[PDB]
Amino acid sequence: DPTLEWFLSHCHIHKYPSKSTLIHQGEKAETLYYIVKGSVAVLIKDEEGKEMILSYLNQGDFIGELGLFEEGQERSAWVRAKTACEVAEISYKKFRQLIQVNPDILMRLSAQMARRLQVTSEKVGNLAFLDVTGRIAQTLLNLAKQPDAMTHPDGMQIKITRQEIGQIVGCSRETVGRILKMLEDQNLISAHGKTIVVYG
Amino acid sequence: TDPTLEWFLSHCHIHKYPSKSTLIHQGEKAETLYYIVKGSVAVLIKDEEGKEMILSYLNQGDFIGELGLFEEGQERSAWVRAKTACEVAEISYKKFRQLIQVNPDILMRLSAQMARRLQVTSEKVGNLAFLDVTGRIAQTLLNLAKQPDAMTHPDGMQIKITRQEIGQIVGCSRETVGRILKMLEDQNLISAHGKTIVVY
Ligand SMILES: Nc1ncnc2c1ncn2[C@@H]1O[C@@H]2COP(=O)(O)O[C@H]2[C@H]1O
Ligand SMILES: Nc1ncnc2c1ncn2[C@@H]1O[C@@H]2COP(=O)(O)O[C@H]2[C@H]1O
Ligand SMILES: [Co+2]
Ligand SMILES: [Co+2]
């Protein structure tokens, strides 16, 4: 679509190696990103320093949008490259100009914000309403739908550490280990360390 | 005076909702957007058995029902309940989308609110994670003792909050809250005197 191409023509490209940080929580926010390639993790850290993965974002996702709409905003979270990342970046000042030229670019941005509120709202509810077995089950399904998932003779294969899962659902690495074992025993997955096949 | 808002409002029609009435039911097909002209509401989600978690309080000046705007056929993501007598302006998504094309500033106003809500709800995820209901209640009382209208007290800091309110913050039953406060008291973390609590 030409709207996106137009948008990108006003951006400039940065490349981020896997594990590098694109955005630090608390920074003054002045620029918008769009993921051209790769994936990032959005992270926050509780009052006792435990890291918490709010979301993964992928090709086609905007980042750094939350600071755009009122003056003097700080970045609300850390964003770290999960894989080699290529991102287009544009100043808020410039983006505001584009918005006036073609409102559709704001529509696409706002649509992702709405989706994120829906998703994050469900996540907070599940923290109270779902047990860790349930949260991990859902997470495994979600990861199987991610661009880095691999089709498998037996289903969809994912690569992920117990630590990462713990940071997603809010539990210890050991808890994850035990629950992965249960889900296996329940014939929902087949574990292989940092390699898991999800059935469906 | 906000010319942009008044223009938008001229395309709306007004509804009056009595205190405790439900403006929006989770699951209903979303086709309209609201703007609160007067009053306050609570946004809540519920587990299969109907236990409530409050996500936000919204009041005069806030949009509600915005999350289904960017793609037809979505369901309301939460319940919205009137806390006081409420007057809301309502408009179809179809009409609102036309306004956006005429003047994208109306979408900017909306998006500013979506962005604040995502930050707030993300913070709630970080707050509730890695804790069970007891830990969540302990944390909740500790945060309230740092809020504006939290009066000083010889033993610590005195706050006023009901069991139902606490339960809605952490997503548990008031029965559960009651049990937990008694223990917290026993463990010399707090002193509970009805709707009044002193946090040490
Ligand atoms: N709950 C969330 N879901 C998805 N993305 C988020 C969430 N919270 C923060 N972000 C992203 O992380 C970014 C951190 O910088 P910004 O606040 O400017 O913009 C933020 C969003 O792009
Ligand atoms: N996390 C949240 N914070 C603030 N408001 C919310 C949140 N989740 C849902 N809402 C509001 O509740 C509404 C329910 O209907 P909609 O999904 O159409 O639009 C939603 C928002 O207006
Ligand atoms: Co740059
Ligand atoms: Co109506």
Author numbering:
A (entry chain A): 8 to 207
B (entry chain B): 7 to 206
What does the paper say about this structure?
CAP (catabolite activator protein) is a DNA-binding protein and transcription activator that recruits RNA polymerase to more than 100 genes in Escherichia coli. The CAP dimer consists of two identical 209-residue subunits, each with an N-terminal binding domain for allosteric effector cAMP, and a C-terminal winged helix–turn–helix DNA-binding motif. CAP has three defined ‘activating regions’, patches of surface-exposed residues that interact with RNA polymerase (RNAP) in specific CAP-dependent promoter classes.
The crystal structure of cyclic AMP–catabolite activator protein (CAP) from Escherichia coli containing cobalt(II) chloride and ammonium sulfate is reported at 1.97 Å resolution. We describe here the structure of cAMP–CAP in a novel fourth crystal form (space group P21212 with one dimer in the asymmetric unit) in which cobalt(II) binds to key residues of CAP AR2. The crystal asymmetric unit contains one CAP dimer (residues 7–207 of chain A and 7–206 of chain B were modeled out of 210 total residues per subunit), with cAMP ligands bound as expected within the N-terminal domain, two cobalt(II) cations, 13 sulfate anions and 420 solvent atoms. The conformation of the CAP dimer in this new crystal form is essentially identical to the conformation observed in earlier structure reports for cAMP–CAP, with two cAMP-binding N-terminal domains related by local twofold rotational (C2) symmetry, and flexibly tethered DNA-binding C-terminal domains that adopt two distinct positions relative to the N-terminal domains. Each of the two CAP subunits in the asymmetric unit binds one cobalt(II) ion, in each case coordinated by N-terminal domain residues His19, His21 and Glu96 plus an additional acidic residue contributed via a crystal contact. In each case, a neighboring CAP dimer related by crystal symmetry contributes two additional ligands from residue Glu37 (O∊1 and O∊2). Octahedral coordination is completed at each site by a solvent water O atom. The three N-terminal domain Co2+-binding residues (His19, His21 and Glu96) constitute a major subset of the four residues previously identified to form CAP activating region 2 (AR2), which participates in transcription activation specifically at class II CAP-dependent promoters. Sulfate anions mediate additional crystal lattice contacts and occupy sites corresponding to DNA backbone phosphate positions in CAP–DNA complex structures. The DNA in the CAP dimer–DNA complexes is strongly bent and electrostatic interactions are thought to play an important role in DNA bending; our structure suggests that the CAP C-terminal domains have an intrinsic capability to bind to DNA half-sites prior to adoption by CAP of its fully bent DNA binding conformation.
